[model samples]
Target: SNADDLQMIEMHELIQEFYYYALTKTVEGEQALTYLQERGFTDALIKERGIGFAPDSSHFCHDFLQKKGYDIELAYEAGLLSRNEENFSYYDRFRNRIMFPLKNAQGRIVGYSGRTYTGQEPKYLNSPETPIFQKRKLLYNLDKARKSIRKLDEIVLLEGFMDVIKSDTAGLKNVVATMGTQLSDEHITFIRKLTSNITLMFDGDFAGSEATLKTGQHLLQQGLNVFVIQLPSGMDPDEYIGKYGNDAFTTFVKNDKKSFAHYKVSILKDEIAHNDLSYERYLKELSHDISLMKSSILQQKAINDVAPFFNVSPEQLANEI
Candidate 1:
């Protein structure tokens, strides 16, 4: 195969990719297939996403790569093999878990995210940083979601990898998930290049609220348009879809989003007395945030929606903003 230039590293990259493909085909993946089926994913959806499974053996990947004429040390460098310090031997990095490939902007597979469906302690694991994969900077399904984001002029941010897959299955293509990390500077930079409109659809809980406010405020200061979808019953997108079906889930997302300022005040409005100075200080803080919106008309919308919290008219709130 021609790489348009070099071939040595590209050849090895394809070889490792084939290794992942083999894992999907091996009958050892039946457990993983059953897990996905229980979660309501069809085999077509599984194949579309190139999902695979790692058998419950530490030597499966290590031995396979070695027999396939690749260096085990190189596989370790690519983050597929783990080393044992006691004997300086390598083994499979993912064991008895479902693996989702992590592709870069060029649509090249660089890493994997392995998740446990049997209630494992870690729950989720990702490929360690190699020359290829950087979890901190990468968003799951971004390569797949880029086109939808541009077409719709919007992006929806979710918390978990399964939430991303569920959103994709629900036909919401402009969605992506963080690698179990915060909304990173690198992630934000690439996202801004794709679309300025983003909706934070994180989990419904104290931690999710903390993350939503943190990410929303940061993006707002960076001049991005932000909205939020608060899920019901502390459920995430994955569970919510399972409970309410696809149509209901889609309708909820489309009709129930709140602008950044409106969500901020609604969630944090219980700080003090309605007439207290502390309440006034909180509103003023939100006023500065409302002022940072990139769109002037959106700024007006935020002021209008948030004015009642101020115990004053939108005219006075605009003065504060």
Candidate 2:
């Protein structure tokens, strides 16, 4: 009963969240959908609520919501808009990118996440957490994928928004994505509620493969059934499908998909063999180099994975260094 009461309070808070979201300009949503459609984002993808756009204008949502009778304070508290101390003029927090509305466990639209069309530095941006939308606590599409995850006993974790859309559009509905960032403990916890099996699908780029290696250990420690899908070459799901079609990706998934362990080792081995660790004193001095992952477990695993190349155990190399 206490949990029920808490949930009720949360649900009521989310109700106010939904109200503010509904009253906002919807400009971002409309423009985002239009952009995706023009970019060949599919009808089925639209039905699944994959892509949205943040408009370039500020105050459109704020003034618009005020006219519709939503309280400015409530909207601000919901993170739908922002203001100054001197006066209140609503500003759209996200601009010039597709908006992906992140929902909660109860399937309420609690916050918006946006990514720019231009491939900007912060390719992904999420709303400031208020009463709703804690970044660490949500997976982007859990509401839609939870049942399938349970039924199939598998859930694919993907890198970003487009990857999720590509997987869904490519007929792999048993998938979800985090808003662009590292895998957080909150993500693992939330996903654990849906299914125990998770496959992390990262891009084929060096950065993404390296990220896969780091997360692999965390997923393994949790006793998850974890797999890693690496696109051959540097293609993400969208580009991979666009170039060779979804069938190419699925065929790889069917036959040639690498285990998380395999991908991890392959990444490390490549890095170790190619990099001159003789310059370890200046790893950061390089224009681009892999940072040591936050988890010591992963960092050690990476070292171990690449050990065969140096003809030594990672522990031996670690001791020597």
Candidate 3:
């Protein structure tokens, strides 16, 4: 255990150093910088976020880290290198991608999330889980945004690191991301240590909405105040900002956020309205959901709001639930 931890620390330090070198000393780094700049990121923002470039060479990083006298085995264990079978040689795991350094609460680099510069499918890639990096345990940008989250007494949870960065560029510093995974109990516990309220701004697609409801329910069950910021369908935070300026985006968040209870009720109503379900099936589904509500106030409100849709009185709805 001690050896694993020690090697993880060493690997992290080496990656951090490599990041700086990629950003400041390489041609691929220059191209990566221009790519980010073209996508509405300023030089200050790029550096502030520790953005880097992984050159498109197969064995460049492997050879470089070995040349620097680091253990090749440790690098492979850190998810930075892969072994080729025929040649029996190590190669870089990331290539020709803009790199985002993933950090822990103490601001130490733990892993990386890389994005393809070209319009390739599977546009984003993350480091495999190693001793130091776990998808369920780490929240991207939390290390940088912790102080701001506490200072503001609230945090914005986005689906990816870029959303967090875009929010930060829009002057919202208390922003963090889930690293493209579902929210975990560890994540909620970590957020509880800093603030009582979280505003989730997930992607604006069907899958995103589903993730919002799932995550919001978890936060609400833990007695945390949850707010839903729904972007227009087919638009992410970055696209939203580019399509509508930061001012408009800010206004939308402040004005359009819905309570978690109301959001769930609205979704169910849409389902009933669009899909031709039998009356018995509709009542059964709604009753089950309402019975699971932890907040009596929310439960009562849901009963009241949904009764008219089902053509029933509040008392009948409450009885069914």
Candidate 4:
């Protein structure tokens, strides 16, 4: 089954650094450098993440890969370059965007996240799934965070790669991100091997809270110790780090995490009319979720923790539970 066709792994590995050079040492990269500096990223973080820039050109990639003499189809297959169907030409996919290398656990370049530096729609134009980048199996920042994750016995899961890097920039190294997809079994197997606890640090918007409820419910079903850190202004970690300095942000995340029961109650309470049977409906919903708690002590604790907010007695909440 190992039919040999093209060598993209070795080639993209080389092309990745080519882009790195464009970002770090070339004239065209200055624009992106200014972008990075204004955004508060340090020189250390840029090199550490293998961040780069792809020139806005149709032929820039062809010149480089052609010298290597690999088939141009290999470039297309690797998701680094795309083919023009009617004209039958290949063009680099990362034009004028900040190139974020998606490295695999084996420490090789596997995929990309081309962030728009200029005014562009679709903030992150990411790579399509390829041989090296099977998204369901590839967790971003796998290699860098594994050491810290193992030592701390905890993993902080964010919604995207930028959040993970932002966390890293703030000196929080045990963070990782899902591949813009569902939590796959491959991710679970790898996470379970490293830690028993995972913190969901989501944007906490209504949309963000939807993913929070969906993903948090999945993690809980896996018997993992799930914690929630909902961002206050509906800002993802990337913007949160920018709005507040690193010290304030880190302490807030580390200290302000809530239990899954607490998270559900807090989010669900927003739906209450405050004067109708919806209040009773909200209490019933909380009663159902809290009753599912595996421990009697947590059940009691959850009821007491939630009782004061609704102006209900602990005994009344216990009766509902």
TM-score, one value per model: 0.91, 0.71, 0.86, 0.88
**What digit string (tens of lDDT, one per residue) describes model 2 on residues 225-252?**
5677777677788787778777777777
Worst 10 residues of 4 by lDDT: 1-10
| Residue 19, candidate 1: C-alpha displacement in angstroms | 7.3
- Model number with the top TM-score: 1
Error of 1 at 5 (Å): 14
lDDT of each: 0.82, 0.63, 0.81, 0.81
Residue pairs of candidate 3 with colliding backbone atoms: none
Residue 272 Cα positional deviation in candidate 3, in Å, after optimal superposition: 2.3
Give per-residue CA lDDT, model 4, range 66-85, as digits (tens).
88887787778878788899
> In model 2, what are the clashing residue pairs, if there are any?
32-53, 52-98, 52-99, 53-99
Compared with the true structure, the alpha-carbon lDDT of candidate 3 equals: 0.81
Query: Can you write out model 1's per-residue Cα lDDT over 1-321, one digit (the tens) per residue?
Result: 233212224423554454445455677766677777899978788777777777787887777677767767778877888899999999888888887877776677777888897899688888888776787777888888999999999999999988999988887889998888888888889999999999999998999999999999999999899999999857999999999999988999999889899999988776634548878678778889988998998899999998887678999999887
The list of candidate 1 runs beyond 4 A from truth reads: 1-27, 272-277
The parts of candidate 2 lying over 4 Å away from their true place are 1-34, 47-55, 85-89, 118-122, 270-321
